[PDB]
Amino acid sequence: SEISRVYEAYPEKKATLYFLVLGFLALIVGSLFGPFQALNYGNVDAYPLLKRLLPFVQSYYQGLTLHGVLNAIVFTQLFAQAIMVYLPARELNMRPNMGLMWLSWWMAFIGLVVAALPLLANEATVLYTFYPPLKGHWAFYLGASVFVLSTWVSIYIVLDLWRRWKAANPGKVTPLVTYMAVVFWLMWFLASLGLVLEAVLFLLPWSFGLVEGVDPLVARTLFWWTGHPIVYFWLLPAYAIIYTILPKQAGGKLVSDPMARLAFLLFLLLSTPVGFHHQFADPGIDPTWKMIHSVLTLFVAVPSLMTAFTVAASLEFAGRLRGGRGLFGWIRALPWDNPAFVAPVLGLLGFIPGGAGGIVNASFTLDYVVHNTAWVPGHFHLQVASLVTLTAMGSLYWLLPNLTGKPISDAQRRLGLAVVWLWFLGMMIMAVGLHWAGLLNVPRRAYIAQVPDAYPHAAVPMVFNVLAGIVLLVALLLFIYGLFSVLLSRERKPELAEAPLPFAEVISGPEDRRLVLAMDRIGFWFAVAAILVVLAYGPTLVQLFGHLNPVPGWRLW
């Protein structure tokens, strides 16, 4: 019972679409709270209006929980599951195990619904970090658990694809996209153990009534074991696209296959053993171990430093082929008329200030200046809310058609450019406002508009936050308008749903071989990555678990 012959031939196409759509709906709902959160930091209180529109909303904090959960956890995971399964599938021209693929979609969907209920009902206003003793409803923890476990099935799917491909290509080096996807998912598996341990040992039995207390320090230590690598889990799908698809949209090629493999390999190795950089201000964790994690964190920056040059060089290369002039001629030669190109490029621009912020936050002692201030949210909207989101939005121009056969008129393409420029512009203005306010000690996760006279010295930066909130509100509205104008049309050219993905060609060299061959020893590198996690977390976790001090839960909303 399939009306589409294209879907019979390429079923993964349908499962991917369901992951994407579910992901953008989540993005839209969670993003609605953004403009209000921005006005709030602009010292303007627009919640009574939101409360009038969305009556179920009981407070600033419930809305902030929905914001972080729907945007940073749901949208990003579904986008990753869609990209890091579909791209490798199309690259290898191999079919994922479809019984498992649809099973992973149902787990995400059922898990999302189950958790959404308590959230929408004000039963778990504990933010996307859900730190104990703050105690949320059991359906929130159970829903999230299932939602996240959906990824374990995704991991299995790709490793299966990989194993099957290696059996039909003895002695061949893993193709690039598949390579990124495999080290990506293996990294995620190691990374997720922290959260799984937290949920299985404490959170779940705690919310079900089995135990009455939970040690806060070990709960957040386990949380951050997963906490940091998850943002790389959000990032790498964007990176896969930027390395293997963007160069093509730009009119060029990826200038180095080996470099892209190396960046991803470094991520598999250094993404997980750095969680203490989210715990610099915590007690009970040895300062030496913090320094060590601070160092491993600076190293994890290396992969992105490489990415910066490799991508920039590929863009310059593309710009030259298009008739690139001098030191900046290549920049104007690029296709600024194509949203699939522009969205991610702008995302990369703001990623510079973003990464700089991160490097600051990672310098142990320097975190004491900005920890828990508006500076942190300033940092990450430049990383996930801009680079990741823009790349995802921009990729809708080639991805949506490839999955539905629905064309994109010139009107939609231009609406898309307006949405992309506004979102980017809006995010930049907000970054300035939040960073500034952060240096002015304004805390984050605070409904400060409710205490008007609490931060007078943040006068001008509050203005920037009010502007951003308005700009982004407009952008969001246009995105919705345009997204639905595309998913609600019936024009359907099945031939474009059958076109291949716009993968870019990759320039290769002579020295590649032996380096590329060493990096393909995945089993070896996996074990190495695992040993580092045991060495960076083992010593501390053994001591915490020998002195557990669980405390009673609380509901303060």
Binding site: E316, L327, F328, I359, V369, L439
Partner: protein
């Protein structure tokens, strides 16, 4: 063709931005010590 002037330019800006952020906050840290 030749040397990647544009790419080098981009990582130059990336490098300078990192320095302003780092040195900038390294200063504040001591000012508040």
């Amino acid at each position: 063709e030749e040397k990647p002037k544009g790419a080098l330019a981009v990582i130059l800006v990336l490098t300078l931005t990192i320095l302003v952020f780092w040195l900038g906050v390294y200063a504040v840290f001591f000012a508040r010590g």
